[PDB]
Amino acid sequence: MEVAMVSAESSGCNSHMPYGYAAQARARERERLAHSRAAAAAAVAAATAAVEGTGGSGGGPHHHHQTRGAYSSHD
């Protein structure tokens, strides 16, 4: 849909009404639907471990094969 480019301006610069959040009144009308996303708990659903945190690698080697007997009594 070809169209001409519009540009809100008048004279060199005798009116540059910087309408910032002022044009945020539109969000106020959309925020009404942002009331349903209250109980979202999604982006966090995935995140936040299952309250888990316990480690400790290891097995437990049991001494095997003792030193030489030596000194044998039999007299």
Curated annotation (Swiss-Prot):
Tissue: Detected in brain (at protein level). Heart and brain.
Localisation: Cell membrane; Cell projection, Axon
Domain of life: Eukaryota
Bias-annotated ranges (Low complexity): 36-50
Post-translational modification: N-glycosylated.
Entry's free-text remark on domains: The N-terminus may be important in determining the rate of inactivation of the channel while the tail may play a role in modulation of channel activity and/or targeting of the channel to specific subcellular compartments. The transmembrane segment S4 functions as a voltage-sensor and is characterized by a series of positively charged amino acids at every third position. Channel opening and closing is effected by a conformation change that affects the position and orientation of the voltage-sensor paddle formed by S3 and S4 within the membrane. A transmembrane electric field that is positive inside would push the positively charged S4 segment outwards, thereby opening the pore, while a field that is negative inside would pull the S4 segment inwards and close the pore.
Subunit structure as annotated in this protein's UniProt entry: Homotetramer and heterotetramer of potassium channel proteins. Interacts with KCNAB1 and KCNAB2. Interacts with DLG1, DLG2 and DLG4 via their PDZ domains. Interacts with SIGMAR1. Part of a complex containing KCNA1, KCNAB1 and LGI1. Detected in a complex with KCNA1. Interacts with KCNA2. Interacts (via cytoplasmic N-terminal domain) with KCNRG.
Function: Voltage-gated potassium channel that mediates transmembrane potassium transport in excitable membranes. Forms tetrameric potassium-selective channels through which potassium ions pass in accordance with their electrochemical gradient. The channel alternates between opened and closed conformations in response to the voltage difference across the membrane.
Family classification: Belongs to the potassium channel family. A (Shaker) (TC 1.A.1.2) subfamily. Kv1.4/KCNA4 sub-subfamily.
Protein name: Potassium voltage-gated channel subfamily A member 4
Portion of the full sequence shown: 1 to 75 of 655
